[PDB]
Amino acid sequence: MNIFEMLRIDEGLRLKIYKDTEGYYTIGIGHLLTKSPSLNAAKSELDKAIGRNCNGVITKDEAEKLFNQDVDAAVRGILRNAKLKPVYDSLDAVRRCAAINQVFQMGETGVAGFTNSLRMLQQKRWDEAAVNLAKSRWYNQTPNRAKRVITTFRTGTWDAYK
Ligand SMILES: Cc1cccc(CN=[N+]=[N-])c1
């Protein structure tokens, strides 16, 4: 297991524009196109991202290319964030993957309310962190995925992904 295999499990792979769990137009491996309800605005973003007129459809190679870009930008983002970087750098490689996964799903603004979980993770209070992480909109809206990510934070193993 690694961050790519992990996010591939959590995000799936779809080659035609679809709506994610939040009802937002998305493609590939969880590549968010826009929060706009206009399918045409979504198609424009797609074409912009890929560099050709896609008419709502991409190839597996194209999906994987966006995925590489999206994972890279998630990591680089964490590193640029004064609140996130010290916690990230305190973690082992497996728990780092959990962090990338959560940021990928929620965004940096997404995790602004996780100050208390972040502190417990920095302290390596793993069970307490895991309890605190689940007290969230995130957990309630996507519990199956959040359970896997939280188990990864709790244990530093890949047990939840097999
Ligand atoms: C950068 C980073 C480190 C640890 C956890 C998370 C996800 N949000 N929380 N808690 C992000």
Side-chain angles (χ1 to χ4, degrees), residues 34-50:
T34 183
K35 296 187 176 178
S36 163
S38 180
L39 176 60
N40 289 336
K43 289 165 174 285
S44 198
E45 291 299 305
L46 177 55
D47 296 349
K48 182 158 51 80
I50 299 297

PDB file of all heavy atoms in Angstrom, residues 34-50:
ATOM      1  N   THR A  34     -15.415  21.512 -10.273  1.00  0.00           N
ATOM      2  CA  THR A  34     -16.011  22.780  -9.834  1.00  0.00           C
ATOM      3  C   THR A  34     -17.089  22.507  -8.807  1.00  0.00           C
ATOM      4  O   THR A  34     -17.637  21.408  -8.765  1.00  0.00           O
ATOM      5  CB  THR A  34     -16.633  23.595 -11.025  1.00  0.00           C
ATOM      6  OG1 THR A  34     -17.145  24.852 -10.552  1.00  0.00           O
ATOM      7  CG2 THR A  34     -17.766  22.819 -11.717  1.00  0.00           C
ATOM      8  N   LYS A  35     -17.392  23.523  -7.995  1.00  0.00           N
ATOM      9  CA  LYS A  35     -18.559  23.465  -7.124  1.00  0.00           C
ATOM     10  C   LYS A  35     -19.818  24.062  -7.779  1.00  0.00           C
ATOM     11  O   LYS A  35     -20.911  23.981  -7.209  1.00  0.00           O
ATOM     12  CB  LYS A  35     -18.236  24.080  -5.748  1.00  0.00           C
ATOM     13  CG  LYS A  35     -17.163  23.267  -5.010  1.00  0.00           C
ATOM     14  CD  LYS A  35     -16.900  23.717  -3.573  1.00  0.00           C
ATOM     15  CE  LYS A  35     -15.890  22.769  -2.918  1.00  0.00           C
ATOM     16  NZ  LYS A  35     -15.547  23.183  -1.535  1.00  0.00           N
ATOM     17  N   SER A  36     -19.659  24.638  -8.979  1.00  0.00           N
ATOM     18  CA  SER A  36     -20.775  25.185  -9.758  1.00  0.00           C
ATOM     19  C   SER A  36     -21.784  24.106 -10.129  1.00  0.00           C
ATOM     20  O   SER A  36     -21.390  23.028 -10.586  1.00  0.00           O
ATOM     21  CB  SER A  36     -20.277  25.839 -11.061  1.00  0.00           C
ATOM     22  OG  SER A  36     -21.351  26.003 -11.985  1.00  0.00           O
ATOM     23  N   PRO A  37     -23.092  24.407  -9.986  1.00  0.00           N
ATOM     24  CA  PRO A  37     -24.090  23.458 -10.494  1.00  0.00           C
ATOM     25  C   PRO A  37     -24.226  23.392 -12.037  1.00  0.00           C
ATOM     26  O   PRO A  37     -25.003  22.582 -12.535  1.00  0.00           O
ATOM     27  CB  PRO A  37     -25.398  23.959  -9.862  1.00  0.00           C
ATOM     28  CG  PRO A  37     -25.201  25.441  -9.764  1.00  0.00           C
ATOM     29  CD  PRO A  37     -23.724  25.607  -9.395  1.00  0.00           C
ATOM     30  N   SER A  38     -23.475  24.208 -12.785  1.00  0.00           N
ATOM     31  CA  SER A  38     -23.567  24.221 -14.253  1.00  0.00           C
ATOM     32  C   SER A  38     -22.628  23.195 -14.889  1.00  0.00           C
ATOM     33  O   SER A  38     -21.405  23.325 -14.800  1.00  0.00           O
ATOM     34  CB  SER A  38     -23.245  25.618 -14.811  1.00  0.00           C
ATOM     35  OG  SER A  38     -23.333  25.635 -16.238  1.00  0.00           O
ATOM     36  N   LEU A  39     -23.206  22.180 -15.525  1.00  0.00           N
ATOM     37  CA  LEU A  39     -22.444  21.127 -16.194  1.00  0.00           C
ATOM     38  C   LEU A  39     -21.525  21.685 -17.291  1.00  0.00           C
ATOM     39  O   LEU A  39     -20.400  21.207 -17.489  1.00  0.00           O
ATOM     40  CB  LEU A  39     -23.393  20.074 -16.769  1.00  0.00           C
ATOM     41  CG  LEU A  39     -22.769  18.940 -17.603  1.00  0.00           C
ATOM     42  CD1 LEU A  39     -21.744  18.073 -16.834  1.00  0.00           C
ATOM     43  CD2 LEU A  39     -23.841  18.084 -18.230  1.00  0.00           C
ATOM     44  N   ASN A  40     -21.998  22.705 -17.995  1.00  0.00           N
ATOM     45  CA  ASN A  40     -21.125  23.389 -18.937  1.00  0.00           C
ATOM     46  C   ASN A  40     -19.899  24.033 -18.264  1.00  0.00           C
ATOM     47  O   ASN A  40     -18.804  23.985 -18.840  1.00  0.00           O
ATOM     48  CB  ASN A  40     -21.913  24.364 -19.821  1.00  0.00           C
ATOM     49  CG  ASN A  40     -22.805  23.640 -20.832  1.00  0.00           C
ATOM     50  OD1 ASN A  40     -22.549  22.486 -21.204  1.00  0.00           O
ATOM     51  ND2 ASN A  40     -23.853  24.322 -21.290  1.00  0.00           N
ATOM     52  N   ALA A  41     -20.057  24.604 -17.057  1.00  0.00           N
ATOM     53  CA  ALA A  41     -18.902  25.202 -16.357  1.00  0.00           C
ATOM     54  C   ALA A  41     -17.914  24.083 -16.000  1.00  0.00           C
ATOM     55  O   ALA A  41     -16.681  24.250 -16.095  1.00  0.00           O
ATOM     56  CB  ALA A  41     -19.324  26.003 -15.120  1.00  0.00           C
ATOM     57  N   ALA A  42     -18.465  22.923 -15.642  1.00  0.00           N
ATOM     58  CA  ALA A  42     -17.649  21.738 -15.320  1.00  0.00           C
ATOM     59  C   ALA A  42     -16.871  21.233 -16.534  1.00  0.00           C
ATOM     60  O   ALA A  42     -15.672  20.942 -16.430  1.00  0.00           O
ATOM     61  CB  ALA A  42     -18.543  20.611 -14.735  1.00  0.00           C
ATOM     62  N   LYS A  43     -17.546  21.158 -17.687  1.00  0.00           N
ATOM     63  CA  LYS A  43     -16.909  20.727 -18.941  1.00  0.00           C
ATOM     64  C   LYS A  43     -15.777  21.675 -19.345  1.00  0.00           C
ATOM     65  O   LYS A  43     -14.744  21.213 -19.847  1.00  0.00           O
ATOM     66  CB  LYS A  43     -17.940  20.594 -20.063  1.00  0.00           C
ATOM     67  CG  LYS A  43     -18.883  19.396 -19.889  1.00  0.00           C
ATOM     68  CD  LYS A  43     -20.092  19.525 -20.806  1.00  0.00           C
ATOM     69  CE  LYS A  43     -20.976  18.290 -20.786  1.00  0.00           C
ATOM     70  NZ  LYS A  43     -20.415  17.147 -21.542  1.00  0.00           N
ATOM     71  N   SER A  44     -15.973  22.986 -19.133  1.00  0.00           N
ATOM     72  CA  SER A  44     -14.917  23.965 -19.407  1.00  0.00           C
ATOM     73  C   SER A  44     -13.696  23.692 -18.528  1.00  0.00           C
ATOM     74  O   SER A  44     -12.550  23.654 -19.026  1.00  0.00           O
ATOM     75  CB  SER A  44     -15.430  25.393 -19.208  1.00  0.00           C
ATOM     76  OG  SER A  44     -14.580  26.322 -19.848  1.00  0.00           O
ATOM     77  N   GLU A  45     -13.930  23.481 -17.219  1.00  0.00           N
ATOM     78  CA  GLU A  45     -12.821  23.185 -16.308  1.00  0.00           C
ATOM     79  C   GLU A  45     -12.078  21.915 -16.741  1.00  0.00           C
ATOM     80  O   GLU A  45     -10.861  21.838 -16.629  1.00  0.00           O
ATOM     81  CB  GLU A  45     -13.309  23.075 -14.863  1.00  0.00           C
ATOM     82  CG  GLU A  45     -13.751  24.422 -14.307  1.00  0.00           C
ATOM     83  CD  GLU A  45     -12.599  25.444 -14.298  1.00  0.00           C
ATOM     84  OE1 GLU A  45     -11.512  25.182 -13.726  1.00  0.00           O
ATOM     85  OE2 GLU A  45     -12.777  26.512 -14.891  1.00  0.00           O
ATOM     86  N   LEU A  46     -12.827  20.927 -17.224  1.00  0.00           N
ATOM     87  CA  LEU A  46     -12.246  19.664 -17.650  1.00  0.00           C
ATOM     88  C   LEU A  46     -11.318  19.906 -18.833  1.00  0.00           C
ATOM     89  O   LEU A  46     -10.148  19.525 -18.811  1.00  0.00           O
ATOM     90  CB  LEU A  46     -13.342  18.668 -18.048  1.00  0.00           C
ATOM     91  CG  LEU A  46     -12.825  17.329 -18.577  1.00  0.00           C
ATOM     92  CD1 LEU A  46     -11.855  16.681 -17.559  1.00  0.00           C
ATOM     93  CD2 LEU A  46     -13.948  16.370 -18.925  1.00  0.00           C
ATOM     94  N   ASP A  47     -11.856  20.560 -19.850  1.00  0.00           N
ATOM     95  CA  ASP A  47     -11.084  20.888 -21.053  1.00  0.00           C
ATOM     96  C   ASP A  47      -9.819  21.674 -20.710  1.00  0.00           C
ATOM     97  O   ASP A  47      -8.738  21.416 -21.276  1.00  0.00           O
ATOM     98  CB  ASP A  47     -11.966  21.653 -22.051  1.00  0.00           C
ATOM     99  CG  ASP A  47     -13.137  20.806 -22.572  1.00  0.00           C
ATOM    100  OD1 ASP A  47     -13.163  19.571 -22.324  1.00  0.00           O
ATOM    101  OD2 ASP A  47     -13.999  21.391 -23.273  1.00  0.00           O
ATOM    102  N   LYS A  48      -9.955  22.591 -19.751  1.00  0.00           N
ATOM    103  CA  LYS A  48      -8.846  23.441 -19.312  1.00  0.00           C
ATOM    104  C   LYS A  48      -7.761  22.574 -18.670  1.00  0.00           C
ATOM    105  O   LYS A  48      -6.571  22.741 -18.937  1.00  0.00           O
ATOM    106  CB  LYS A  48      -9.345  24.499 -18.327  1.00  0.00           C
ATOM    107  CG  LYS A  48      -8.270  25.451 -17.847  1.00  0.00           C
ATOM    108  CD  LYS A  48      -8.815  26.780 -17.325  1.00  0.00           C
ATOM    109  CE  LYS A  48      -9.923  26.631 -16.287  1.00  0.00           C
ATOM    110  NZ  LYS A  48      -9.407  26.343 -14.938  1.00  0.00           N
ATOM    111  N   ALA A  49      -8.195  21.652 -17.815  1.00  0.00           N
ATOM    112  CA  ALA A  49      -7.286  20.772 -17.088  1.00  0.00           C
ATOM    113  C   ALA A  49      -6.517  19.789 -17.980  1.00  0.00           C
ATOM    114  O   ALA A  49      -5.369  19.459 -17.707  1.00  0.00           O
ATOM    115  CB  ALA A  49      -8.080  19.999 -16.005  1.00  0.00           C
ATOM    116  N   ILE A  50      -7.175  19.309 -19.025  1.00  0.00           N
ATOM    117  CA  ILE A  50      -6.649  18.246 -19.887  1.00  0.00           C
ATOM    118  C   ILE A  50      -5.946  18.823 -21.135  1.00  0.00           C
ATOM    119  O   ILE A  50      -5.018  18.217 -21.674  1.00  0.00           O
ATOM    120  CB  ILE A  50      -7.805  17.261 -20.297  1.00  0.00           C
ATOM    121  CG1 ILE A  50      -8.422  16.591 -19.047  1.00  0.00           C
ATOM    122  CG2 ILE A  50      -7.348  16.208 -21.296  1.00  0.00           C
ATOM    123  CD1 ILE A  50      -7.469  15.721 -18.279  1.00  0.00           C
TER     124      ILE A  50
END
